[PDB]
Design an enzyme around this catalytic site. Structure first.
Site, PDB file in Angstrom:
ATOM      1  N   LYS A 166      -6.002  -5.466   1.725  1.00  0.00           N
ATOM      2  CA  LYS A 166      -6.021  -4.783   0.439  1.00  0.00           C
ATOM      3  C   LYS A 166      -6.711  -5.654  -0.603  1.00  0.00           C
ATOM      4  O   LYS A 166      -6.197  -6.704  -0.988  1.00  0.00           O
ATOM      5  CB  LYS A 166      -4.602  -4.432  -0.014  1.00  0.00           C
ATOM      6  CG  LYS A 166      -4.551  -3.675  -1.330  1.00  0.00           C
ATOM      7  CD  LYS A 166      -3.126  -3.324  -1.722  1.00  0.00           C
ATOM      8  CE  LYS A 166      -3.098  -2.542  -3.027  1.00  0.00           C
ATOM      9  NZ  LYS A 166      -1.714  -2.178  -3.437  1.00  0.00           N
ATOM     10  N   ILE A 217      -9.171  -0.623   0.526  1.00  0.00           N
ATOM     11  CA  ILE A 217      -8.688  -1.160   1.796  1.00  0.00           C
ATOM     12  C   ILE A 217      -9.761  -1.175   2.888  1.00  0.00           C
ATOM     13  O   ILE A 217     -10.436  -0.172   3.122  1.00  0.00           O
ATOM     14  CB  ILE A 217      -7.464  -0.351   2.290  1.00  0.00           C
ATOM     15  CG1 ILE A 217      -6.213  -0.748   1.499  1.00  0.00           C
ATOM     16  CG2 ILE A 217      -7.240  -0.553   3.779  1.00  0.00           C
ATOM     17  CD1 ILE A 217      -4.969   0.026   1.874  1.00  0.00           C
ATOM     18  N   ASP A 268       6.153   4.025  -7.070  1.00  0.00           N
ATOM     19  CA  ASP A 268       4.967   4.810  -6.736  1.00  0.00           C
ATOM     20  C   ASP A 268       4.992   5.353  -5.308  1.00  0.00           C
ATOM     21  O   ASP A 268       4.021   5.214  -4.563  1.00  0.00           O
ATOM     22  CB  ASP A 268       3.703   3.973  -6.951  1.00  0.00           C
ATOM     23  CG  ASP A 268       2.453   4.826  -7.078  1.00  0.00           C
ATOM     24  OD1 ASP A 268       2.560   5.969  -7.572  1.00  0.00           O
ATOM     25  OD2 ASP A 268       1.365   4.356  -6.683  1.00  0.00           O
TER      26      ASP A 268
END
Ligand SMILES: Nc1ncnc2c1ncn2[C@@H]1O[C@H](COP(=O)(O)OP(=O)(O)OP(=O)(O)O)[C@@H](O)[C@H]1O
Ligand SMILES: [Ca+2]
Lengths: 576, 358
Positions: A38, A29, A139
């Site tokens: 990103k 990033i 995640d």
């Protein structure tokens, strides 16, 4: 032209509200002048955001994505996901600073837990929001959660491993993941798991104990101390260890410790006892996070890790690589001396604290001596901090616990001195700087021996008074022990409830305590005078490991005698 | 007919009839709104409520919620008719006059009381000691006060307020118990910790000595049984918790402890009356109920005061009810029935009469 002056461009059609790229420049990033880029799975991530935005809507706690762009980076041009920057700290840094201010009394307990439960309600609202669009995050972890300074709001910022409900996850973090996640598809109930394990990570402080994993939930030690003691008698919380079942532990158990089927969803979890009871106003919670993020960040604790059999073996593995490299004539002389210095610090820390068996300690100590021999047989800026650390150890107040520490420090300074002058024999001669260093080592060795002699003299004195004290106990020891054991067999405990409800129960204990105090009524003055001498001696002897193991055994003999005597001295005030 | 005595506090409300030894009704000063219940039922039904405290640091901050407590006090706790009994209310030291007039308006226009009077809480505690002169340390759930009183008059210039009390200590005990692996977080568990505080805590005469005793052995450890049956065991937390009263740095506060606050109040009074205050230091409130606090208080003030000064600490066996008892006594006097604000007087003068009669 550097890439800080190369323009950006769009790849597809940016979302409504997207900014003009014309004036934007560049400073994983990267940051853009505030926006964030990103740098396959990236295009599928943008599509995930768009789907969420049109099905469930935008969310304050979810990232604000503008679209796909082409950015100048690494002597190339990359596809980049453009999004608003969440100016603040990451979840790990925020929760560490939050708990830190709590312990320092900057905020009280209702402010801390209120904020914690506020953060939980937000994260579970996000997982509920994604579930609307049929998207599973897969995640959620402290790395993917960033708090905004201006609003004190937690924002999740990644969707790279997402998947639709019922299909296999693109990926997961093994340390936080649910048991079913990634085996056999994904589910909202797997995201709820992640939310809790993420919170459990920052509440318990799992970053200080790499040997345990957040998804393992909490261990329950109920018949033994669920804590560790420090130098002055203060209990210290053990990460991942619970001493009693509470709303907090039930919250962990009812989620991290159940199958997906029995596990509550986002809305159900917010109705849990832990998230329902003990909450505060959202703005109060937001204000606390603001004040935290605008304050001083609590740094990632270095060398805070307890020396365990696992970690001691790890340190042992590090030394053996040096032994191996020495056999193959590629020994790094610089890093082996500095590594040995951390070994001594680790060994000292392992002595004053508990845990690791003494057999492993002597074994670890022998390995250090072995490494010295190999180094010696093998034949300044790196050994300089080693002397500075030891010199500060010399200017502190010492105990009997420090004798084994000072001995090894002497051996180290002695080895450093030998190494330096041995290299001058068939290598670079002793320079003006090395020479002055040799005498600084020599002066520390002298001070080390002077102080070490005093401690052992004082120890022999303390060992003498120790035996004298044990002798006096002989008249009351076993009798008082039998009486207190008979009393403790009745399981003395303060009960919850009104004085009426506990009346019969309390007067039963007073009667038991009375009987016990009548059986020892002839030693009540001996035991009173006994603890007046034994307690100050126990303080001088400490609780740490000592070289004289007979002294250690006798020290615990006194500690048990003192425990018996002092409790009987207080028995009337405690139960009558 | 019996006059009513109502003592409104930050954490607990005490109510009863004048002429009785103890208040017949003692309940939490909690009001629970949806997303209405008062006291214990508000706690038992907390799962569908938002609990609030009308009183903050001894001062009313929510008058709507204060009405429901008084209504609950009258019709549910005491179960009497407010219009048939004169009522004696209590107020914190330095209570704003706007609060006093509002309190007056409510008793007369909402509950239609025949007569009322409001007295200073600390002053009532001194009366219950049988004293007209002395300094009072009042310490409850939300606020602590040091009030120097001479010949019946409180000395406003020497009064000190200390935002340090019971709920802070309970909150403090909650934090330091986590170091033993005990994680209490909910309001329900907060009450349980408060129970632990009221039964296992005590003030050490020598703090550093007791710490040495706690570290050297397990002699100071005591066990507690939770309502679900779980047994916990605590050690130096027993005396570390109320030690915060003397060392506010434990709570993150940069302020004086109760012993030094009492001293500063005495030192703001005239020189010629300090002796009388030192000899009549009275303790009031539930927070002052810790075993050993009197001896420690004696010790600490002696160290601050000049050598020639005699220091005496009065600590009644149930000083958690001293304010109410002082009220019950005052309202029982027929020499005092001359002081009530009558409904007639209120209709003539209005709320502003409280400044003249009370
Ligand atoms: N035996 C005890 N030991 C320690 N603390 C106690 C004891 N009994 C009561 N308390 C504490 O006293 C507090 C309430 O006492 P009290 O009713 O005198 O104060 P209050 O009027 O509610 O508060 P405030 O005076 O600030 O308005 C509670 O916080 C409670 O924990
Ligand atoms: Ca009060």
């Amino acid at each position: 032209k550097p890439q800080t002056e190369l323009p950006l461009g769009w790849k597809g059609k940016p979302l409504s509200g997207a900014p003009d790229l014309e004036g934007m420049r560049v400073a994983h990033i990267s940051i853009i002048e505030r926006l964030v880029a990103k740098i396959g799975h990236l295009f599928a991530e943008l599509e995930a955001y768009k789907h969420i935005y049109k099905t469930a809507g935008k969310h304050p706690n979810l990232a604000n994505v503008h679209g796909m762009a082409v950015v100048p980076y690494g002597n190339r041009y990359y596809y980049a996901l453009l999004m608003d920057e969440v100016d603040g700290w990451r979840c790990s840094d925020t929760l560490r600073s939050l708990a830190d201010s709590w312990k320092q009394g900057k905020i009280n307990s209702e402010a801390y837990w209120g904020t914690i439960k506020f953060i939980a309600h937000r994260l579970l609202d996000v997982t509920n929001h994604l579930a609307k669009a049929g998207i599973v995050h897969n995640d959620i972890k402290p790395g993917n959660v960033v708090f905004d300074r201006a609003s004190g709001e937690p924002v999740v910022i990644d969707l790279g491993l997402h998947s639709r409900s019922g299909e296999q996850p693109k990926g997961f973090t093994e340390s936080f993941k649910a048991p079913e996640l990634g085996v056999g598809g994904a589910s909202e109930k797997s995201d709820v798991f992640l939310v809790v394990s993420t919170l459990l990570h920052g509440i318990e402080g799992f970053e200080k104990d790499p040997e345990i994993k957040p998804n393992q939930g909490l261990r329950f030690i109920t018949s033994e101390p669920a804590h560790v003691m420090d130098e002055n008698g203060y209990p210290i919380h053990r990460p991942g260890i619970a001493g009693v079942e509470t709303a907090y532990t039930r919250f962990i158990t009812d989620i991290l410790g159940v199958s997906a089927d029995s596990r509550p969803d986002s809305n159900e979890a917010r109705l849990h006892e832990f998230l329902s009871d003990g909450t505060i106003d959202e703005e109060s919670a937001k204000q606390i996070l603001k004040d935290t993020l605008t304050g001083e960040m609590s740094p990632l604790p270095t060398d805070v890790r307890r020396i365990t059999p696992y970690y001691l073996r790890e340190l042992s593995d590090l030394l053996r690589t040096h032994l191996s490299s020495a056999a193959t004539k590629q020994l790094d002389m610089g890093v082996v001396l500095s590594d040995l210095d951390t070994m001594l610090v680790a060994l000292d820390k392992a002595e004053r604290e508990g845990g690791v068996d003494k057999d492993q300690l002597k074994s670890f100590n022998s390995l250090i001596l072995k490494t010295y021999s190999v180094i010696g047989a093998y034949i300044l800026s790196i050994v300089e901090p080693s002397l500075q650390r030891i010199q500060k150890h010399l200017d502190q107040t010492h105990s009997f616990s420090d004798i084994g520490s000072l001995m090894r420090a002497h051996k180290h300074l002695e080895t450093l001195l030998e190494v330096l002058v041995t290299l001058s024999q068939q290598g670079q001669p002793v320079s003006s700087e090395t020479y002055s260093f040799l005498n600084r080592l020599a002066e520390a060795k002298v001070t080390l021996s002077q102080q070490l002699n005093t401690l052992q003299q004082q120890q022999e004195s303390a060992k003498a008074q120790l035996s004298i004290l044990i002798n006096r106990s002989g008249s009351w020891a076993d009798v008082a022990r039998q009486s207190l054991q008979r009393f403790d067999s009745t399981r003395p405990v303060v009960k919850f409830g009104t004085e009426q409800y506990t009346a019969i129960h309390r007067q039963m204990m007073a009667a038991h305590a009375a009987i016990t105090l009548q059986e020892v009524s002839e030693f009540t003055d001996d035991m009173r005078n006994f603890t007046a001498d034994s307690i100050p001696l126990l303080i001088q002897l400490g609780r740490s490991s000592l070289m004289d193991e007979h002294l250690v055994e006798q020290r615990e003999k006194l500690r048990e005698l003192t425990t018996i005597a002092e409790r009987l001295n207080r028995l009337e005030r405690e139960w009558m | 007919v019996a006059a009513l005595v109502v003592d409104n506090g930050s954490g607990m409300c005490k109510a009863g009839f004048a002429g009785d030894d103890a208040p017949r009704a003692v309940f939490p000063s909690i009001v629970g709104r949806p997303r209405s219940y008062v006291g214990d039922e508000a706690q038992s039904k907390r799962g569908i409520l938002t609990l609030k405290y009308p009183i903050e640091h001894g001062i009313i901050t929510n008058w709507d919620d204060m009405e429901k407590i008084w209504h609950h006090t009258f019709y549910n706790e005491l179960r009497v008719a407010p219009e048939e009994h004169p009522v004696l209310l209590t107020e914190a030291p330095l209570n704003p006059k706007a609060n006093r007039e509002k309190m007056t308006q409510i008793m007369f226009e909402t509950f239609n009381s025949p007569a009322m009077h409001v007295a200073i809480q600390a002053v009532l505690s001194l009366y219950a000691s049988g004293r007209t002169t002395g300094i009072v340390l009042d310490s409850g759930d939300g606020v602590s006060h040091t009030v120097p009183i001479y010949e019946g008059y409180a000395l406003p210039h020497a009064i000190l307020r200390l935002d340090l009390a019971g709920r802070d200590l309970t909150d403090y005990l909650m934090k330091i118990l986590t170091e033993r692996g005990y994680s209490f977080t909910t309001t329900a568990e907060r009450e349980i910790v408060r129970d632990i505080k009221e039964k296992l805590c005590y003030v050490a005469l020598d703090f550093e000595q007791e710490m040495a005793t706690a570290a050297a052995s397990t002699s100071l450890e005591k066990s507690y049984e939770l309502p679900d049956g779980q047994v916990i065991a605590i050690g130096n937390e027993r005396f570390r918790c109320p030690e915060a009263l003397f060392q506010p740095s434990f709570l993150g506060m940069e302020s004086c402890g109760i012993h030094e606050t009492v001293y500063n109040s005495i030192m703001k009074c005239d020189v010629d009356i300090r002796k009388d205050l030192y000899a009549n230091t009275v303790m009031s409130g539930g927070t002052t109920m810790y075993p050993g606090i009197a001896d420690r208080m004696q010790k600490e003030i002696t160290a601050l005061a000049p050598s020639t000064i005699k220091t005496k600490i009065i600590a009644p066996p149930e000083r958690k009810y001293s304010v109410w008892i002082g009220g019950s006594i005052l309202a029982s006097l027929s020499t005092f029935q001359q002081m009530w604000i009558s409904k007639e007087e209120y209709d003539e003068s209005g709320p502003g009469i409280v400044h003249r009669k009370c």
